Write a protein that binds this DNA or RNA. Structure first.
Ligand SMILES: [K+]
Ligand SMILES: [K+]
Ligand SMILES: [K+]
Ligand SMILES: [K+]
Ligand SMILES: [K+]
Ligand SMILES: [K+]
Ligand SMILES: [Mg+2]
Ligand SMILES: [Mg+2]
Ligand SMILES: [Mg+2]
Ligand SMILES: [Mg+2]
Ligand SMILES: [Mg+2]
Ligand SMILES: [Mg+2]
Ligand SMILES: [Mg+2]
Ligand SMILES: [Mg+2]
Ligand SMILES: [Mg+2]
Ligand SMILES: [Mg+2]
Ligand SMILES: [Mg+2]
Ligand SMILES: [Mg+2]
Ligand SMILES: [Mg+2]
Ligand SMILES: [Mg+2]
Ligand SMILES: [Mg+2]
Ligand SMILES: [Mg+2]
Ligand SMILES: [Mg+2]
Ligand SMILES: [Mg+2]
Ligand SMILES: [Mg+2]
Ligand SMILES: [Mg+2]
Ligand SMILES: [Mg+2]
Ligand SMILES: [Mg+2]
Ligand SMILES: [Mg+2]
Lengths: 129, 247, 205, 343, 132, 210
RNA sequence: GGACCUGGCGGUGCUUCAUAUCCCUCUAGAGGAGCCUGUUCUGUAAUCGAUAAACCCCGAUCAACCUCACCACCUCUUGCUCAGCCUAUAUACCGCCAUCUUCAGCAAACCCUGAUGAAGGCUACAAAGUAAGCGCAAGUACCCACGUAAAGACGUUAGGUCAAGGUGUAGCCCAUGAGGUGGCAAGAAAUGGGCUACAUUUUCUACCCCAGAAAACUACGAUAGCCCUUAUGAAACUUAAGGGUCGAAGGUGGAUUUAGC
């Protein structure tokens, strides 16, 4: 919760999604009931902290694997990375570490979205002529 | 029912960045309030109530828990205690409802004048099935007429006369007003109660505002709601049950 | 009740309202500004602001009332107060200048003191132990002592031992007896106390 | 009296007696049961005993361009209408009596082995027509409850598979057996294993594992050997697509342990390509029917080792006395190698 | 437990109409009356006769339009006019509905000695208020 | 662990015993198996803290001389109050001295109890003179003041209602003058036979059609 | 037989409880008398049903004939009915209900944990539960937002009712059906509920609350008994009302027990 506000802002700014609140049973494994039969689930889940507030793995780590969603995760030395698709060993506590991670992912995501627009636009201009 | 339109477009991407919380509107509000508390630090009752949980559940158009409502209120209170500016004051008032604080102050009847020019007020009172209408004159000698009869001839029971005395005595105006009242229905005590209430309301036109509030706090301006309870079928009375037969 | 819990009981006391503002404390100032926002119950027909209002006699009258007949109950009360006063005016005129100073002629003072002489300080409770019943002494609250004094007086006057004597003569005679620490009702107080002394060893139950 | 008559629904609800203390606890049993019949089924509006022909209700309104008039079927032709309705009634009864039976399972009264069909199509236009469902166990579970005493629920174990390596199983629990079937089969399709098959007919190597107290020993077999396995394993092997295998189940014969024990062993089998990649050597298959011809079944994708695999004169592998006792002709059993139906 | 006119809860599969879903205590609160006449007003006569006529008309129409009625009848009386308003299905051919309307209006007018009119509203299927 | 169980999953949770947490708690929530343990052991800690303050002269000279002994100390689960009990002395005169000093010391003692930062948040402490049997004490106070005035069946024996039994006889005199139960698991069903029997119960629209 | 789960139970622990309630406390009663009325028992040629809580002025907002289903006698036979049956079975049912309920839970569709065992699924500074249905709630009726009604699921007692009506199954069809005439419906008693009393806060009269008399064997007290009128009816020792006569038990009721915020 020290970084809930920071993470929600980073997600909004890059045009993605954040879930920093209490994780209700079945958000991923029972999503169609909770959201609707046509709900689209995330294609990638990034954990800036893989542990919950009782020092156990965040339930979404297991549930992301159950739903075959790849996970990126900052994994500190007390964390379990077995089920994290792309783990990144790193400090998850210090504000300087967490701020850095948010800048890097925010920038990586923002650059890739701008690159997609550049390529698409070029592919269209060349297509007409 | 204003269930929000599909919360994603054709590509399936949700519109709101907090969609996957399932409570995007509630958490978007908590996020905005938490952010304001941060900015203040970087920079540094009777009139209204808080909105009820069902009124928050309509502003947000979502279902809320009881603890969800509390956390939001605890966060707004934490925002008032700070040096909130004008921008942080329009926001809090969106969640402060105008409590129906219509004053308990008694309404004063108008002072009328008769053919002879004598000032008087008129009011009404109800006790059980008795209904009274009283005319209290601004000046008088303490005469009370009930259906054209002297009050002590109409009310031979001493307790009924004490009830007529109660309003005038409480404001120290015995022997200062003339009253002509008409009462119908109910028994002797209920009629004394109805006249008591009618005279007290009319007498409020000739006393100070503080005296009218003292009469209110003495129970002289409240209609007694205690009326006979209906008998129910299968029991002897309104509350009494038939004897539970010996087993 | 037809009153919502929001309704507060009315305070019928002329003095309470004429009291100046300066004399008021910061706590008493808050209570007065609060009641201006509260709902107040209608004053009951029983109590008024009259200077002759006596809550103790009004309560004794209700404990004598049979089947809602307040007119009859109150008639008996005022007839008792008149009978007490006439008995004392007769004792006063028949006395010497020295004894006259000690003779009370106010029936309200006699009525109040007569009841205070009958109030039992301590009472007993029927307690069960091993299929056997043993009474246990216990202090009595102030409400209970005052209620028992009025219940014993009314009960004694309703006793069938009195043959064809009207209630105002019976009650007036018992009140003047109790006023002098004499009578059956005073004995009932003494007996209850004496029993509560013989069961002191049972106070641990 | 006309006013004392009731509707058919009221009359059947009373006569059938389906709600009541008899039907609450099954206190009444029904070898002879009143069966509801729709008595308005074959009835035509306008047709009565008198045989009147009402134009526009039971006969055509216009005949030869002219409006028909009220007419009455004669006694002879009316008699044939009544007879035809009786035959149509007994004919309707006969057709209903005829019903197509279903093939039994492992035994006549057993649910095990019975097909339940494909799982239901998912909400998002998802379909599983390629999958077959088989029942493995149907149990009656009895729960003691604080206020209601012994209650009866159903636990079902079902397996699903498409016959091409994709198979799964799930438990279902419901008060009604059909609901337990729907829950299990629909859930199983979301817990699918992929099972590797050698030449799409057998396992890649002998598998010997224990799950809890249930032992399963499986042997790779050549084509034509068939499924000589516990009947439940046969059912699962048909769903996976295994045609030739021997299996022996020992210890506890618990259907659930056997099912999940079987899937655990079949999902952890190393293929020949994995063996070649792990050891960087060729996997060469020698078949006695093909003589000394070496058949390379798998080659490493990465570099190929130059050092031969060490030849330990004697391997320290643990052997099954049952396998050895059989190879030495010392295994005598009247029940082994018995003639059985094709599986 | 009270039983009168209460469609009891099932497993969520029994379609009920608005009328069937409301117990008697909701009469005059959430649902109106199925017959309107003056016989039950204070100081009015012939409530007994109006009631028998209503019971007959409901049975007559049930058996005259078998399988066609999609809801209870609404009976209206104005002066000596009797109006029967019925919600029916769209299974019977229109010719049969016109035959039965002409037949029923005529027969009921001669039976009760009053001008009787039948007003039919067709629905594709029984209107479902909720699934109990 | 020991025979005393320590399996709780949320063992790393930071215990928060404060008055504010009680208000922000699910009403449905009930105390867990090992939730009482922390309360039983935290209440004991308060007993330890209070006992040391009484016997150390540094805290207060008046308190030390009293030599007060704490009989019991049990905090409340509400987190609003704390119950502490000290043993009374024989001399009622001495009892008054102890309570007076303890009553005034309590306000300061609370701040001294905050010196234990681990136990900093201490609900206001209540001190209860151990008048365990005040019923006799209060009764005997009134019993001396009180004015006493001038000072001078067989039904249970037998165990039966012999009377009621002989009343019913008198009225009479006047008037005249196992199976097998099947094991539930073996109960037979026909659902499969009905399933195997078969259980078979076997467009365009136009305006002005013809 | 071992281990474990659930339930039940414990002369099992601790804790908090019932709000007209488990006990005490408050008020008026019942239990004693007469009478009214139900039931039981007995009686009779002479119904039936309810019958611990949850029967007992209950089906009946009602039996002189009728009602009536009972008994005796007599009579009819395709029968008021495209017959009839108040015949058996409420342990075949619908219908309408009692009961806990002066309760808050019930049943589905999913999801997850336990190795995919019987099982389990909550922590708000939150740790797997959730989108809907029924009940509660809300809303509505009555004089309010209070109160009182109404409402009150699933399940429990094979609870009540085949005699409201309908009806499954079994039985009767010159009789177990139909009709007529007359008749029973009592009290040796026991018991439930109620009424009226035992009186002086009473009794009678005037009045509807400022009165006068009465007040113990000519008082209080029968709505009972007996006698005579009147009303209703074809029919009244019988039902009701009134009058006359009569003036009894009863002198405020043990254990126990009912109701009321
Ligand atoms: K147990
Ligand atoms: K009594
Ligand atoms: K029933
Ligand atoms: K019936
Ligand atoms: K029957
Ligand atoms: K009685
Ligand atoms: Mg860390
Ligand atoms: Mg009453
Ligand atoms: Mg067979
Ligand atoms: Mg009821
Ligand atoms: Mg009696
Ligand atoms: Mg009987
Ligand atoms: Mg019986
Ligand atoms: Mg019976
Ligand atoms: Mg019973
Ligand atoms: Mg007869
Ligand atoms: Mg008769
Ligand atoms: Mg018969
Ligand atoms: Mg039954
Ligand atoms: Mg309203
Ligand atoms: Mg209400
Ligand atoms: Mg009710
Ligand atoms: Mg409700
Ligand atoms: Mg039964
Ligand atoms: Mg019948
Ligand atoms: Mg017969
Ligand atoms: Mg007399
Ligand atoms: Mg008489
Ligand atoms: Mg006559």
């Amino acid at each position: 919760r020290q970084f809930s506000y920071l993470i929600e802002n980073m997600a909004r700014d890059c045009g993605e999604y954040a879930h920093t609140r209490y994780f209700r049973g079945g958000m991923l494994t029972n999503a169609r009931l909770l959201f609707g039969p046509t709900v689209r689930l995330p294609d990638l889940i990034i954990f800036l902290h893989t542990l919950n507030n009782i020092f156990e793995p965040h339930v979404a780590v297991r549930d992301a694997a159950k739903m075959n969603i790849p996970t990126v995760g900052i994994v500190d030395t007390n964390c379990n990375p077995c089920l994290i698709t792309y783990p990144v060993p790193g400090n998850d506590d210090s504000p300087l570490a967490v701020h850095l991670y948010c800048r890097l992912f925010q920038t990586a995501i923002t650059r890739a979205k701008e690159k997609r627009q550049q390529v698409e636009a070029l592919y269209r201009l060349q297509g007409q002529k | 029912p204003r269930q929000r339109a599909i919360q994603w477009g054709e590509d399936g991407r949700p519109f709101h960045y907090l969609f996957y919380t399932g409570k995007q509107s509630y958490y978007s509000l908590m996020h905005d309030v938490y952010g304001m508390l941060l900015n203040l630090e970087k920079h540094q009752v009777i009139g209204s109530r808080w909105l009820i949980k069902e009124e928050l559940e309509e502003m947000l158009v979502e279902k809320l828990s009881d603890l969800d409502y509390m956390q939001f209120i605890r966060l707004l209170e934490k925002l008032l205690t700070s040096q909130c500016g004008a921008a942080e004051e329009e926001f809090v008032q969106r969640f402060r409802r105008s409590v129906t604080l219509e004053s308990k102050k008694q309404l004063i009847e108008p002072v009328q004048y008769d053919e002879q020019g004598m000032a008087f007020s008129k009011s009404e009172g109800k006790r059980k099935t008795a209904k009274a209408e009283a005319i209290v004159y601004k000046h008088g000698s303490g005469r009370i007429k009930v259906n054209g009869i002297d009050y002590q001839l109409y009310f031979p029971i001493t307790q009924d006369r004490e009830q007529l005395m109660f309003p005038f005595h409480f404001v120290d105006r015995l022997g200062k007003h003339d009253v002509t009242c008409t009462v119908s229905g109910g028994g002797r005590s209920a009629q004394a109660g109805a006249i008591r209430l009618a005279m007290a309301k009319a007498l409020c036109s000739f006393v100070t505002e503080d005296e009218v509030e003292w009469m209110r706090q003495a129970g002289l301006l409240t209609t007694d709601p205690r009326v006979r309870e209906r008998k129910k079928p299968g029991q002897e009375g309104a509350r009494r049950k038939f004897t539970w037969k010996k087993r | 009740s037809r009153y919502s819990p929001e309704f507060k009981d009315p305070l019928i006391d002329k003095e309470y309202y004429r009291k100046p503002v300066e004399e008021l404390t910061e706590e008493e100032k808050y209570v007065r500004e609060l009641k201006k926002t509260q709902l107040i119950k209608a004053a009951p027909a029983g109590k008024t602001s009259s200077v002759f209002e006596d809550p103790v006699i009004s309560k004794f009258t209700n404990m004598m009332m049979i089947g809602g007949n307040k007119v009859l109950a109150r008639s008996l009360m005022i007839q008792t107060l008149e009978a007490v006063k006439r008995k004392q005016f007769e004792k006063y005129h028949a006395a010497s200048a020295e004894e006259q100073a000690t003779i009370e002629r106010n029936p309200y003072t006699i009525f109040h003191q007569a009841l205070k002489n009958c109030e039992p300080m301590i009472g007993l409770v029927p307690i069960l132990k091993g299929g056997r019943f043993y009474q246990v002494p216990v202090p009595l609250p102030d409400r209970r002592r005052r209620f028992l004094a009025m219940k014993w007086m009314i009960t004694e006057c309703r006793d069938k031992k009195h043959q064809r004597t009207l209630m105002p003569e019976k009650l007036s005679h018992k009140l003047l007896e109790a006023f002098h620490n004499q009578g059956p009702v005073i004995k009932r107080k003494h007996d209850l106390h004496k029993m509560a002394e013989a069961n002191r060893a049972l106070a641990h139950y | 009296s006309f006013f004392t008559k009731l509707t058919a629904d009221e009359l059947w609800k009373g006569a059938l007696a389906e709600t009541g203390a008899g039907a609450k606890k099954g206190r009444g049993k029904r070898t002879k049961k009143k069966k509801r019949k729709d008595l308005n089924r074959g009835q035509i509006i306008g047709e009565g005993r008198y045989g009147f022909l009402w134009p526009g209700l039971n006969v055509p309104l216009m005949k030869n361009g002219a409006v028909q008039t009220i007419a009455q079927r004669s006694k002879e032709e009316q008699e044939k209408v009544e007879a035809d309705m009786i035959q149509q009634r007994e004919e309707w009864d006969r057709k209903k009596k005829m019903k197509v039976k279903r093939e039994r399972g492992w035994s006549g009264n057993s649910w095990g082995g019975i097909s339940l069909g494909p799982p239901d199509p998912g909400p998002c236009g998802e379909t599983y027509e390629d999958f077959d469902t088989r029942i493995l166990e149907v149990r009656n579970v009895f729960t003691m409850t604080a206020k209601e005493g012994r209650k009866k629920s159903i636990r079902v174990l079902v397996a699903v598979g498409n016959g091409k390596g994709a198979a799964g199983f799930s438990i279902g629990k419901a008060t009604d057996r059909m609901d337990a079937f729907r829950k299990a089969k629909n859930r199983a399709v979301h817990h699918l294993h992929y099972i590797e098959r050698y030449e799409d007919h057998t396992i890649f190597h002998d598998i010997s594992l224990r799950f809890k107290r249930t032992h399963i020993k499986m042997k790779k077999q050549p084509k034509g050997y068939g499924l000589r396995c516990h009947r439940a394993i046969i059912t699962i092997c048909r769903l996976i697509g295994i045609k030739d295998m021997y299996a022996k189940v020992s210890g506890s014969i618990n259907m659930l342990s056997l099912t999940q024990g079987l899937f655990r062993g079949l999902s952890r089998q190393e293929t020949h390509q994995q063996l070649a990649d792990k050891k960087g050597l060729h996997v060469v298959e020698i078949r006695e029917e093909c003589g000394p011809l070496p058949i390379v079944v798998a080659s490493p994708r990465g570099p190929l080792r130059k050092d031969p695999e060490p030849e330990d004169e004697v391997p320290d592998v643990k052997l099954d006395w049952e396998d050895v006792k059989t190879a030495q002709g010392m295994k005598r059993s009247v029940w082994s190698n018995l003639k059985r139906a094709a599986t | 437990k009270n039983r009168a006119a209460r469609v009891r809860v099932s497993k969520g599969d029994k379609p009920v109409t608005y009328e069937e879903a409301h117990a008697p205590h909701y009469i005059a609160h959430r649902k109106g009356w199925l017959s309107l006449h003056t016989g039950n007003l204070d100081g009015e006569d012939h409530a007994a006769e109006r009631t028998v006529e209503d019971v007959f008309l409901r049975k007559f129409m049930w058996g005259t339009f078998p399988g066609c009625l999609a809801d209870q009848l609404v009976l209206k009386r104005r002066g000596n006019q009797l109006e029967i308003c019925a919600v029916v299905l769209r299974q019977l051919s229109p010719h049969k509905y016109y035959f039965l309307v002409g037949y029923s209006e005529t027969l009921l007018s001669y039976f009760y000695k009053c001008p009787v009119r039948l007003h039919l509203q067709t629905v594709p299927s029984k209107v479902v208020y909720k699934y109990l | 662990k020991v025979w005393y169980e320590s399996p709780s999953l949320g063992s790393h949770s930071t215990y928060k015993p404060s008055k504010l947490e009680f208000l922000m708690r699910s009403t449905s929530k009930k105390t867990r198996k090992e939730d009482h343990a922390r309360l039983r052991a935290l209440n004991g800690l308060l007993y330890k803290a209070l006992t040391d303050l009484l016997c150390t002269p540094e805290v207060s000279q008046e308190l030390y001389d009293l030599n007060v002994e704490l009989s019991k100390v049990s905090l409340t689960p509400d987190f609003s109050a704390c119950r502490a009990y000290w043993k009374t002395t024989l001399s009622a005169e001495q009892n008054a001295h102890m309570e007076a000093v303890l009553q005034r010391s309590a306000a300061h003692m609370r701040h001294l109890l905050m010196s234990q930062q681990t136990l900093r948040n201490v609900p206001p402490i209540v001190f209860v003179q151990d008048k365990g049997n005040a019923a006799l004490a209060e009764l005997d106070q009134l019993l001396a003041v009180a004015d006493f005035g001038p000072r001078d069946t067989s039904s249970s024996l037998c165990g039966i209602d012999h009377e009621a039994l002989n009343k019913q006889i008198m009225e009479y005199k006047r008037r005249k003058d196992g199976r097998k139960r099947a094991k539930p698991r073996l109960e037979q069903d026909s659902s499969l036979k009905s399933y195997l029997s078969g259980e078979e119960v076997e467009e365009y629209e136009c305006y002005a059609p013809d």
